[PDB]
mmCIF file of C-alpha atoms in Angstrom:
data_model
loop_
_atom_site.group_PDB
_atom_site.id
_atom_site.type_symbol
_atom_site.label_atom_id
_atom_site.label_comp_id
_atom_site.label_asym_id
_atom_site.label_seq_id
_atom_site.Cartn_x
_atom_site.Cartn_y
_atom_site.Cartn_z
ATOM 1 C CA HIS R 7 214.183 -38.362 3.433
ATOM 2 C CA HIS R 8 216.874 -41.154 3.693
ATOM 3 C CA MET R 9 219.030 -40.957 0.472
ATOM 4 C CA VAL R 10 222.451 -42.623 -0.173
ATOM 5 C CA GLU R 11 225.682 -40.488 -0.104
ATOM 6 C CA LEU R 12 227.359 -40.952 -3.545
ATOM 7 C CA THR R 13 230.818 -39.748 -4.741
ATOM 8 C CA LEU R 14 232.015 -39.917 -8.387
ATOM 9 C CA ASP R 15 234.760 -42.621 -8.887
ATOM 10 C CA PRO R 16 237.805 -40.904 -10.457
ATOM 11 C CA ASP R 17 239.130 -44.339 -11.659
ATOM 12 C CA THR R 18 236.037 -44.590 -13.973
ATOM 13 C CA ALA R 19 235.967 -40.948 -15.235
ATOM 14 C CA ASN R 20 236.749 -40.229 -18.892
ATOM 15 C CA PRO R 21 239.980 -38.135 -18.908
ATOM 16 C CA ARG R 22 238.185 -35.032 -20.337
ATOM 17 C CA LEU R 23 235.606 -35.003 -17.478
ATOM 18 C CA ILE R 24 236.220 -32.400 -14.689
ATOM 19 C CA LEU R 25 235.042 -33.715 -11.273
ATOM 20 C CA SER R 26 234.522 -31.246 -8.351
ATOM 21 C CA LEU R 27 236.702 -31.637 -5.188
ATOM 22 C CA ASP R 28 233.637 -32.926 -3.171
ATOM 23 C CA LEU R 29 233.229 -35.629 -5.936
ATOM 24 C CA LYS R 30 229.553 -34.490 -6.418
ATOM 25 C CA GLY R 31 229.812 -32.451 -9.652
ATOM 26 C CA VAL R 32 230.808 -33.353 -13.241
ATOM 27 C CA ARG R 33 231.522 -31.042 -16.272
ATOM 28 C CA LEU R 34 233.219 -31.846 -19.604
ATOM 29 C CA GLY R 35 236.646 -30.104 -20.078
ATOM 30 C CA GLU R 36 238.303 -29.059 -23.432
ATOM 31 C CA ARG R 37 241.452 -31.140 -22.811
ATOM 32 C CA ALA R 38 241.980 -34.744 -21.649
ATOM 33 C CA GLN R 39 243.867 -34.965 -18.344
ATOM 34 C CA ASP R 40 246.989 -37.207 -18.542
ATOM 35 C CA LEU R 41 245.589 -39.969 -16.235
ATOM 36 C CA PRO R 42 246.877 -43.554 -15.931
ATOM 37 C CA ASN R 43 244.420 -45.897 -17.752
ATOM 38 C CA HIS R 44 242.535 -48.211 -15.367
ATOM 39 C CA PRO R 45 240.414 -51.212 -16.558
ATOM 40 C CA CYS R 46 237.337 -49.353 -15.109
ATOM 41 C CA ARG R 47 238.044 -45.976 -16.875
ATOM 42 C CA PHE R 48 235.678 -45.006 -19.749
ATOM 43 C CA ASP R 49 238.465 -44.189 -22.265
ATOM 44 C CA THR R 50 236.168 -42.908 -25.126
ATOM 45 C CA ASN R 51 232.560 -42.320 -23.901
ATOM 46 C CA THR R 52 232.238 -39.198 -21.635
ATOM 47 C CA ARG R 53 230.985 -41.123 -18.551
ATOM 48 C CA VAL R 54 231.697 -41.732 -14.853
ATOM 49 C CA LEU R 55 229.981 -43.882 -12.175
ATOM 50 C CA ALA R 56 229.627 -43.317 -8.404
ATOM 51 C CA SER R 57 232.140 -45.546 -6.498
ATOM 52 C CA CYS R 58 229.074 -47.320 -4.938
ATOM 53 C CA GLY R 59 227.623 -50.339 -6.853
ATOM 54 C CA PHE R 60 224.310 -51.968 -5.653
ATOM 55 C CA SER R 61 223.619 -55.732 -5.137
ATOM 56 C CA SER R 62 220.145 -55.478 -3.358
ATOM 57 C CA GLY R 63 217.388 -53.245 -1.836
ATOM 58 C CA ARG R 64 215.866 -49.764 -2.581
ATOM 59 C CA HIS R 65 218.139 -46.607 -2.852
ATOM 60 C CA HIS R 66 217.253 -42.944 -3.637
ATOM 61 C CA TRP R 67 219.403 -39.963 -4.668
ATOM 62 C CA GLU R 68 218.930 -36.687 -6.565
ATOM 63 C CA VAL R 69 220.714 -35.185 -9.610
ATOM 64 C CA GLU R 70 220.745 -31.421 -10.319
ATOM 65 C CA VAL R 71 221.039 -30.796 -14.089
ATOM 66 C CA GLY R 72 222.195 -27.890 -16.296
ATOM 67 C CA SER R 73 219.740 -26.165 -18.664
ATOM 68 C CA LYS R 74 222.105 -26.528 -21.718
ATOM 69 C CA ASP R 75 222.214 -29.786 -23.818
ATOM 70 C CA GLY R 76 224.879 -32.427 -23.132
ATOM 71 C CA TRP R 77 224.030 -34.571 -20.103
ATOM 72 C CA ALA R 78 222.680 -38.083 -19.503
ATOM 73 C CA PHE R 79 222.344 -39.809 -16.088
ATOM 74 C CA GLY R 80 220.821 -42.932 -14.547
ATOM 75 C CA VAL R 81 222.236 -46.377 -13.612
ATOM 76 C CA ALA R 82 224.463 -48.921 -15.424
ATOM 77 C CA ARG R 83 225.104 -52.656 -14.911
ATOM 78 C CA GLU R 84 228.635 -53.275 -13.593
ATOM 79 C CA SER R 85 229.640 -55.059 -16.918
ATOM 80 C CA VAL R 86 228.909 -51.808 -18.842
ATOM 81 C CA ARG R 87 231.847 -51.636 -21.337
ATOM 82 C CA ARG R 88 234.567 -48.930 -20.706
ATOM 83 C CA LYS R 89 236.954 -49.498 -23.700
ATOM 84 C CA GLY R 90 236.406 -47.892 -27.144
ATOM 85 C CA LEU R 91 233.261 -46.241 -28.543
ATOM 86 C CA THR R 92 230.227 -48.148 -27.104
ATOM 87 C CA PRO R 93 226.498 -47.560 -27.817
ATOM 88 C CA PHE R 94 224.516 -45.627 -25.099
ATOM 89 C CA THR R 95 221.509 -48.028 -24.977
ATOM 90 C CA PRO R 96 219.627 -50.417 -22.602
ATOM 91 C CA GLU R 97 221.184 -53.389 -24.519
ATOM 92 C CA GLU R 98 224.631 -52.161 -23.265
ATOM 93 C CA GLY R 99 223.611 -51.879 -19.547
ATOM 94 C CA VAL R 100 222.626 -48.156 -19.583
ATOM 95 C CA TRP R 101 219.204 -46.861 -18.368
ATOM 96 C CA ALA R 102 219.272 -43.044 -18.494
ATOM 97 C CA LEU R 103 217.392 -39.807 -19.144
ATOM 98 C CA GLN R 104 219.091 -37.245 -21.457
ATOM 99 C CA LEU R 105 218.913 -33.529 -22.432
ATOM 100 C CA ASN R 106 219.757 -33.232 -26.157
ATOM 101 C CA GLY R 107 218.754 -30.801 -28.961
ATOM 102 C CA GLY R 108 216.663 -28.790 -26.475
ATOM 103 C CA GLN R 109 214.598 -31.942 -25.704
ATOM 104 C CA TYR R 110 214.354 -34.342 -22.682
ATOM 105 C CA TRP R 111 214.586 -38.095 -23.667
ATOM 106 C CA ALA R 112 214.403 -41.477 -22.009
ATOM 107 C CA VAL R 113 217.189 -43.402 -23.838
ATOM 108 C CA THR R 114 215.180 -46.301 -25.258
ATOM 109 C CA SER R 115 216.541 -48.195 -28.323
ATOM 110 C CA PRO R 116 216.491 -48.157 -31.236
ATOM 111 C CA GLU R 117 214.618 -44.779 -30.936
ATOM 112 C CA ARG R 118 214.842 -42.458 -27.866
ATOM 113 C CA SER R 119 211.447 -41.660 -26.165
ATOM 114 C CA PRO R 120 210.702 -37.898 -26.035
ATOM 115 C CA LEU R 121 209.444 -36.825 -22.535
ATOM 116 C CA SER R 122 206.863 -34.002 -22.180
ATOM 117 C CA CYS R 123 207.930 -32.955 -18.678
ATOM 118 C CA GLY R 124 208.758 -29.201 -19.017
ATOM 119 C CA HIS R 125 211.980 -27.670 -17.546
ATOM 120 C CA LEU R 126 214.053 -29.829 -15.072
ATOM 121 C CA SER R 127 216.467 -28.486 -12.379
ATOM 122 C CA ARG R 128 216.665 -31.589 -10.116
ATOM 123 C CA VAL R 129 215.501 -35.261 -10.473
ATOM 124 C CA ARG R 130 215.027 -37.978 -7.789
ATOM 125 C CA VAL R 131 216.254 -41.466 -8.883
ATOM 126 C CA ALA R 132 214.653 -44.495 -7.084
ATOM 127 C CA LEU R 133 216.568 -47.765 -7.706
ATOM 128 C CA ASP R 134 214.551 -50.881 -6.685
ATOM 129 C CA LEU R 135 216.605 -54.122 -6.998
ATOM 130 C CA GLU R 136 213.862 -56.091 -5.139
ATOM 131 C CA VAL R 137 211.177 -55.475 -7.865
ATOM 132 C CA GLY R 138 213.679 -54.609 -10.677
ATOM 133 C CA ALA R 139 212.900 -50.898 -11.507
ATOM 134 C CA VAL R 140 214.600 -47.522 -11.758
ATOM 135 C CA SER R 141 212.258 -44.459 -11.776
ATOM 136 C CA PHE R 142 212.978 -40.720 -12.281
ATOM 137 C CA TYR R 143 210.914 -37.879 -10.701
ATOM 138 C CA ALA R 144 211.081 -34.045 -11.049
ATOM 139 C CA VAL R 145 211.530 -32.890 -7.396
ATOM 140 C CA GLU R 146 209.320 -29.702 -7.843
ATOM 141 C CA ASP R 147 206.092 -31.914 -7.769
ATOM 142 C CA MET R 148 207.652 -35.435 -7.779
ATOM 143 C CA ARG R 149 206.054 -35.849 -11.291
ATOM 144 C CA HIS R 150 206.890 -39.222 -12.946
ATOM 145 C CA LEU R 151 209.332 -38.812 -15.890
ATOM 146 C CA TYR R 152 210.093 -42.505 -16.848
ATOM 147 C CA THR R 153 210.462 -45.982 -15.302
ATOM 148 C CA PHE R 154 212.673 -48.728 -16.841
ATOM 149 C CA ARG R 155 211.438 -52.105 -15.533
ATOM 150 C CA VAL R 156 214.559 -54.334 -15.508
ATOM 151 C CA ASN R 157 215.419 -57.772 -14.114
ATOM 152 C CA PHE R 158 218.904 -56.594 -12.920
ATOM 153 C CA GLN R 159 221.152 -59.710 -12.740
ATOM 154 C CA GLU R 160 224.430 -57.965 -11.679
ATOM 155 C CA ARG R 161 225.441 -54.941 -9.523
ATOM 156 C CA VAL R 162 223.852 -51.603 -10.565
ATOM 157 C CA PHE R 163 225.882 -48.320 -10.455
ATOM 158 C CA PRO R 164 224.722 -44.680 -10.672
ATOM 159 C CA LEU R 165 225.903 -43.323 -14.108
ATOM 160 C CA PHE R 166 226.712 -39.766 -15.417
ATOM 161 C CA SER R 167 227.754 -38.573 -18.882
ATOM 162 C CA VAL R 168 228.423 -34.984 -20.049
ATOM 163 C CA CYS R 169 229.369 -34.804 -23.811
ATOM 164 C CA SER R 170 229.204 -30.947 -24.157
ATOM 165 C CA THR R 171 231.033 -28.086 -22.435
ATOM 166 C CA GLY R 172 228.544 -25.502 -21.069
ATOM 167 C CA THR R 173 226.514 -28.017 -18.922
ATOM 168 C CA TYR R 174 226.782 -30.063 -15.671
ATOM 169 C CA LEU R 175 225.402 -32.791 -13.373
ATOM 170 C CA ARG R 176 225.537 -32.480 -9.515
ATOM 171 C CA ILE R 177 224.751 -35.346 -7.055
ATOM 172 C CA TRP R 178 222.631 -34.663 -3.905
ATOM 173 C CA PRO R 179 223.024 -35.256 -1.054
#
């Protein structure tokens, strides 16, 4: 199965995020690193993109996910805002799933959409820029979790947020 190789982009990472050395894994730390601000860095929201943005075609990858609340992952338009507190919503260029209050959500606005999917360990993301879709599948039985149909009009970047200690996101492969 032909999947893209993604690495987290340290220039984008919120200063409190802890990236692994292989740039696959993301946790939230207790203290903000002293990092030089970069126009790309999320200075307030607890997010980080892969260094790869997408302009065209179909691309797959997988995300392993902690069992404790705190994570959200998906894709974001390149213009997603980095500076100050920003809403986490499709309006703002953010199409994600989320584990929060013991519940899986698709992050619709103005209300999140509860998913009835059972426990997740690993999710396949399929980004289709030709049709304009991003779908999520539980790898155990490739069960369908959610699709956002979107007419993407700029580059689309894999997105990760961890806003609690005690949980993680890991990119595969």
